[PDB]
């Protein structure tokens, strides 16, 4: 018998949005997991002390990790800070970073 499972999410909003994406391959799976849990916690802190809204998407496939951060109602300072916490991953583990203004 044939089966289908589907899931979708649609977001409709207004305002400015900055998107930051990183992709890397790692060989410290549990370490990176705890760093991602720390990074999510830092983004929640940064969102709390600002008027912005922050969405983070994480995809993991056997060591390949892709992270997407979207910031709505952002200010330049807040974008610059988020890159910084991300820059450590790119520099230390190698990988790719992409900024969509």
Element (H, E) at 31: helix 29-48
How was this structure obtained?
X-ray
| Total count of residues recorded for the chain | 101
The contacts of residue 72 (CB under 8 Å, 6+ apart) are: 13, 15, 16, 17, 52, 53, 54, 55
Backbone angles phi, psi at 87, to 5 degrees: -55, -35
Point out which residues pair with 96 in neighbouring strands.
23
**Alpha carbon distance 31, 63 (integer Å):** 12
3-state secondary structure at position 80: helix
Element (H, E) at 97: strand 96-100
> What is the number of helices (H) and of strands (E) in the chain?
2, 4
Question: How close are the terminal C-alpha atoms of the chain, in Å?
Answer: 46
**Alpha carbon distance 66, 58 (integer Å):** 6
Per the structure block, which two tokens stand in for 45?
A: 């802190």
Is residue 73 within 8 A of residue 16, CB to CB? The reply is yes
């Amino acid at each position: 018998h044939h089966h289908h499972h589907g899931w979708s999410e649609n977001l409709y909003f207004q305002g400015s949005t900055v998107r930051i994406e990183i992709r890397f391959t790692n060989m410290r799976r549990e370490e990176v997991q705890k760093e991602l849990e720390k990074f999510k916690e830092r983004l929640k802190e940064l969102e709390k002390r600002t008027g912005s809204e922050i969405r983070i998407e994480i995809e993991e496939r056997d060591g390949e990790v892709r992270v997407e951060v979207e910031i709505r109602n952002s200010h330049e300072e807040e974008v610059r800070q988020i890159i910084e916490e991300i820059e450590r991953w790119v520099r230390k583990m190698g990988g790719e970073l992409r900024v969509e203004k």
